[PDB]
Design a protein around this ligand. Structure first.
Ligand code: CLA
Ligand code: CLA
Ligand code: CLA
Ligand code: CLA
Ligand code: CLA
Ligand code: CLA
Ligand SMILES: CCCCCCCCCCCCCCCC(=O)OC[C@H](COP(=O)(O)OC[C@@H](O)CO)OC(=O)CCCCCCCCCCCCCCC
Ligand SMILES: CCCCCCCCCCCCCCCC(=O)OC[C@H](COP(=O)(O)OC[C@@H](O)CO)OC(=O)CCCCCCCCCCCCCCC
Ligand SMILES: CCCCCCCCCCCCCCCCCC(=O)OC[C@H](COP(=O)(O)O)OC(=O)CCCCCCCCCCCCCCCCC
Ligand SMILES: CC1=C(/C=C/C(C)=C/C=CC(\C)=C/C=C/C=C(C)/C=C/C=C(C)/C=C/C2=C(C)CCCC2(C)C)C(C)(C)CCC1
Ligand SMILES: CC1=C(C/C=C(\C)CCC[C@H](C)CCC[C@H](C)CCCC(C)C)C(=O)c2ccccc2C1=O
Ligand code: SF4
Ligand code: SF4
Lengths: 80, 74, 165, 75, 64, 41, 143
């Protein structure tokens, strides 16, 4: 239950969506960049908070931005 | 040295990066900034420096204590 | 005397300390033939100690209640009492040498910044250039005051990057 | 089959060109020190012969010669 | 006609949240399509992520 | 040679050389002018 | 349109000798995950819970606890084997979801027909100030 947002500085490089290990980020058609694609975070219920997505964004400042918040079993990464 | 090691073992890289940012502003104001970026030590290197200093300080303390004790008595 | 401190050449505790330290070294001497390498080393040490204690008494350093030289860190209260060699003169000497090294480094940075690979000329120093600038750094008071009166020493903050408040 | 002696003649040329350029062994370390982290990783990866080459032959040769250097230091 | 700064000129960054705020960089291209940020700027100095190329708009890329 | 002198200009060697030179100089100064507590001119 | 496939429960499992990292009590009260793939040869792979298993010819099924373990296994398959798999979420009442290849197309490729959830059209500092949103049960980055 972390709040993942994607801002318009995105250039659609697909790095953030290959980085994510839990499939929270996705590519959708867009038009505000040359690649004509932007990222989106529909499955944000699955966000663990690893910030691998945020560590792969080349834009300055970062386009994918994670805000850790409420903790659930999915967010806390509990196998037991 | 041992106590110095604690600097590296309790702190984190972010504090040091922003402190170095202020230092670099001070240098920029006088045209003496390096072309090679001062970057705070990586997290792994911070931990490595901390453990190296901890072990150095502890072992040197015990070594000196042992040697002085055994060379003054015995 | 500047603050209840009699000149070490007068203080009895200073001479007493001289006496005791020399007597310790004499006791260390009384174990070797006065012609062996240890004996020569001890004799040289005693000569060095006596020279130091006479030199300190000659220069008029101030001794306290104990027999230890004290220093004065106020210009004016050290210049009207003949004690400017304690902090003020070494202050000038340091400030000069520190400024020399700092100005040499600063000018080397500003000289290698305007080159092809400035990040390369910091890990592989250009020794002739470094040595030339190290020699030019000796006039640093003159050149630094020139650059301050010129305004070229510093950079206006409108061009230095800052954090988002 | 059959244990024997096998050597390559003159695999490496004894020059000083690579001492003039630090970081030659590692591809990532190459292309200048943009930040001091380059200075630190230059030493942190000096003997990590695994990341300088994938050929086990070259790794083994480097290990052999490094052992000779260690023996020289001990002597 | 061509829009924005010329290719190869030096510009001063004016985005307050950028690493190179108030620092100069050379233009390597300006896209003409209609992107929000078409100006592509190259700096000598890298940022914390190790990159040196960034895209800026046109109101926040004062030339010279 | 040129590359050897380039190696001798590297930060690891030149820094160590300069520290050795300055250390030697301070050691020599203290060997000839020892125990100097003030700037007696 | 796209139709997610149906979870066939009678599927052979990889040859595995038993592990101490398998399911726990959380798979009987909350939920667990199932991954299915199709192997072109019987080959040894690394199960994310420690140890090595052998995947068999044809369809293979393997059930894990966390989704992220399933995606790690799938990334291993995609890189070192070029095998494409499907991840279902099984609840203990019987309900089954279909998870990772949501639209049949992988998350890195644009599908045209996806929902742009959580996509602000402002930059990063164009958010509101915390003093303005004080006593609101939210954070500045969701206004
Ligand atoms: C107080 C004395 C002291 C002592 C005994 C040490 C000792 C040590 N330091 Mg250290 N250090 C010190 C102060 C000290 N440091 C200070 C004040 C700082 C700045 C805050 C640092 C910052 C520092 C860093 C960043 C690192 C060390 C490292 C090391 C270890 C590497 C050995 C070495 O230096 O190579 C041999 C020394 C020479 C060949 C000559 C050095 C010449 C210098 C540049 C002058 C070593 C045990 C390294 C380490 O921890 O390894 C993992 C390391 O990365 N130190
Ligand atoms: C940096 C801090 C500092 C401090 C705490 C002092 C303190 C003092 N100075 Mg002084 N001084 C300083 C810096 C300082 N100085 C500097 C930088 C210079 C060089 C410009 C001087 C030059 C100086 C002279 C020439 C004299 C003193 C004197 C004195 C003493 C008398 C002060 C007085 O009468 O009322 C203070 C008056 C105010 C307006 C305050 C006093 C203890 C006098 C002295 O030696 O007394 C025996 C004396 O004549 N000072
Ligand atoms: C010639 C290079 C140079 C110059 C001109 C300066 C100048 C300055 N530094 Mg700085 N600094 C330097 C190198 C330099 N620094 C290096 C290499 C480091 C890493 C250890 C630092 C770390 C540093 C810190 C943490 C701080 C400063 C600060 C300051 C300012 C206060 C003055 C001071 O006492 O600093 C102190 C000087 C030191 C702590 C170390 C000096 C390093 C050596 C002695 C000088 C290097 C000379 C160079 C290697 C030789 C090149 C010669 C050439 C021929 C090749 C001042 C404008 C302070 C500030 O914020 O400003 C108010 C501050 O806090 N510096
Ligand atoms: C965080 C780690 C770190 C590291 C590894 C370095 C490393 C280095 N710094 Mg640096 N620096 C740092 C932090 C760091 N710095 C920080 C936090 C600051 C404050 C912003 C600075 C500011 C700074 C300045 C201003 C300078 C350096 C310079 C240097 C280089 C000097 C080495 C040399 O030339 O030997 C020593 C060289 C000599 C002794 C010259 C010998 C003289 C005769 C002629 C030979 C060196 C590679 C200096 C440089 O550019 O190198 C030339 C330089 O001036 N640094
Ligand atoms: C027992 C310790 C030991 C041993 C056996 C080695 C062995 C080796 N190192 Mg190594 N290294 C060591 C410690 C050691 N290192 C330490 C403590 C560091 C700390 C950072 C490094 C950092 C390091 C780096 C960065 C690199 C190596 C590299 C190498 C390989 C190339 C050696 C070579 O060809 O030079 C030949 C050796 C000789 C000709 C014998 C003399 C040694 C040198 C030349 C002395 C020159 C100094 C000279 C007297 C001037 C300085 C004195 C003056 C300043 C006063 C080699 C197998 C290089 C490599 O190939 O990476 C794989 C490489 O790039 N080392
Ligand atoms: C900021 C701290 C500090 C300060 C101000 C001093 C100051 C002094 N120390 Mg000391 N020392 C210190 C730290 C300090 N030390 C530390 C940390 C240690 C532990 C290693 C020592 C260990 C030590 C010893 C063993 C001795 C001194 C001595 C001295 C005196 C020697 C003066 C001299 O060298 O002749 C003058 C030198 C010059 C005029 C050369 C000037 C040109 C140089 C080369 C420029 C350098 C540019 C780079 C002097 C008053 C000596 C003494 O006799 O005390 C009275 C002495 O025996 N110190
Ligand atoms: C009493 C003795 C005290 C020693 C205690 C030892 C504990 C430290 C063990 C940590 C492992 C370090 C090795 C791996 C290193 C490691 O992985 O550490 C981590 C750190 C950097 O690693 P990173 O995670 O950043 O790696 C990323 C890079 O590989 C990618 O480019 O390395 C360092 O600490 C800096 C090395 C500088 C040290 C060289 C500076 C000068 C010293 C020269 C040699 C001194 C003389 C030697 C004696 C003759
Ligand atoms: C300003 C004039 C104040 C001097 C008053 C003279 C009265 C005795 C003062 C006195 O003791 O005599 C001269 C004084 C030091 O002489 P000393 O008495 O310390 O001489 C004895 C020992 O130094 C030698 O054994 O020299 C100075 O430091 C004057 C300051 C000039 C500063 C030069 C550069 C500063 C920058
Ligand atoms: C002592 C080392 C002093 C080396 C002086 C500069 C060497 C440059 C050089 O020889 O050119 C490389 C030289 C070729 O000259 P270059 O084309 O200019 O690099 O390479 C060689 O043919 C032999 C390299 C060995 C150099 C001597 C090594 C030390 C011999 C004593 C062993 C102890
Ligand atoms: C006399 C004396 C003293 C002092 C006093 C006082 C009170 C002082 C002060 C002062 C002050 C109140 C100051 C201020 C200032 C300001 C500024 C502003 C500064 C500066 C600097 C700079 C700017 C530098 C630069 C440079 C150079 C020149 C060289 C190298 C490079 C560089 C760039 C670093 C005492 C008694 C202690 C002791 C005795 C002596
Ligand atoms: C002080 C500190 C720094 C700042 C440290 C820096 C910038 C390194 C300082 C090295 C200076 C530039 C050289 C000092 C030279 C010494 C006299 C000897 C160095 C020994 C060498 C052989 C390495 C960090 O970057 C850091 C990172 C992560 C956790 C803790 C910390 C931390 O505590
Ligand atoms: S990594 Fe950043 S720029 Fe690239 S697609 Fe993701 S959000 Fe956009
Ligand atoms: S923080 Fe991790 S899990 Fe969450 S969206 Fe980013 S990469 Fe995915």
């Amino acid at each position: 239950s972390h709040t993942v947002k994607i801002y318009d500085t995105c250039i659609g490089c697909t790095q953030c969506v290959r980085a994510c290990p839990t499939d929270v980020l996705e590519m959708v058609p867009w038009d505000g960049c040359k690649a004509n694609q932007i990222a989106s975070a529909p499955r944000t219920e699955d966000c663990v908070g690893c910030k691998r997505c945020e560590s792969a964004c080349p834009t300055d400042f970062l386009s994918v931005r994670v805000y850790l918040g409420s903790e659930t079993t999915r967010s806390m990464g509990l196998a037991y | 040295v041992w106590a110095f090691s604690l600097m590296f073992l309790f702190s984190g890289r972010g504090y040091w990066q922003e402190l170095i940012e202020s230092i670099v502003w001070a240098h920029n104001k006088l045209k003496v900034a390096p072309a090679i970026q001062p970057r705070a030590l990586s997290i792994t290197q911070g931990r490595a420096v901390g453990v190296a200093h901890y072990l150095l300080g502890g072992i040197a303390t015990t070594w000196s204590f042992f040697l002085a004790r055994i060379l003054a008595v015995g | 005397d500047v603050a209840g401190l009699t000149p070490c050449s007068e203080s009895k505790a200073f001479a007493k300390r001289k006496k005791n330290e020399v007597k310790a070294l004499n006791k260390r001497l009384k174990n070797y033939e006065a012609d062996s390498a240890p004996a020569l080393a001890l004799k040289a040490t005693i000569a060095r100690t006596e020279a130091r204690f006479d030199k300190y008494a000659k220069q008029g350093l101030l001794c306290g209640t104990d027999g230890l030289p004290h220093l004065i860190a106020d210009p004016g209260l050290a210049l009207r009492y003949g004690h400017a060699g304690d902090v003020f003169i070494p202050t000038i000497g340091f400030i000069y040498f520190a400024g020399w090294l700092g100005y040499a480094g600063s000018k080397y940075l500003q000289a290698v910044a305007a080159t092809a690979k400035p990040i390369e000329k910091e890990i592989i120093i250009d020794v002739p250039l470094a040595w030339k600038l190290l020699w030019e750094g000796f006039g640093w008071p003159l050149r630094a005051f020139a650059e301050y009166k010129n305004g070229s020493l510093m950079e206006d903050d409108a061009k230095i990057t800052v954090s988002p408040r | 089959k059959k244990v024997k002696i096998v050597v390559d003649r003159n695999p490496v040329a004894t020059n000083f060109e690579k001492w003039a350029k630090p970081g030659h062994f590692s591809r990532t370390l190459s292309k200048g020190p943009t930040t001091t982290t380059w200075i630190w990783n230059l030493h942190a990866d000096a003997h990590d012969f695994d990341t300088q080459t994938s050929d086990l032959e070259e790794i083994s040769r480097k290990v052999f010669s490094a052992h000779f250097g260690q023996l020289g230091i001990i002597f | 006609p061509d829009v924005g700064p010329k290719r190869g000129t030096q510009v001063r960054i004016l985005r307050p949240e950028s690493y190179w705020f108030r620092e100069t960089g050379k233009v390597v291209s300006v896209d003409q399509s209609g992107i929000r940020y078409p100006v592509v700027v190259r700096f000598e100095k890298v940022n914390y992520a190790g990159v040196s190329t960034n895209n800026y708009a046109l109101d926040e890329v004062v030339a010279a | 040679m040129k590359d050897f002198t380039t190696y001798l200009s590297t930060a690891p060697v030149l820094t160590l050389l300069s520290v050795t030179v300055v250390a030697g100089l301070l050691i020599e100064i203290n060997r000839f002018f020892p125990d100097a507590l003030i700037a007696a001119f | 349109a796209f139709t997610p496939p149906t979870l066939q429960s009678d599927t052979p499992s990889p040859i595995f000798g038993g592990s101490t990292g398998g399911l726990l009590s959380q798979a009987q009260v909350e939920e667990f995950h199932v991954i299915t793939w199709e192997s072109k040869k019987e080959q040894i792979f690394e199960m994310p819970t420690g140890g090595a298993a052998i995947m068999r010819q044809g369809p293979n099924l393997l059930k894990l606890a966390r989704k992220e373990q399933c995606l790690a296994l799938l990334t291993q398959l995609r890189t070192k084997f070029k095998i494409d798999g499907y991840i279902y979420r099984v609840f203990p009442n019987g309900e089954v979801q279909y998870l990772h290849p949501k639209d049949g197309v992988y998350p890195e490729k644009v599908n045209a027909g996806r929902s742009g959830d959580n996509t602000n059209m402002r930059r990063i500092g164009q958010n509101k100030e915390p003093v303005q949103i004080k006593f609101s049960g939210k954070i500045p980055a969701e206004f």
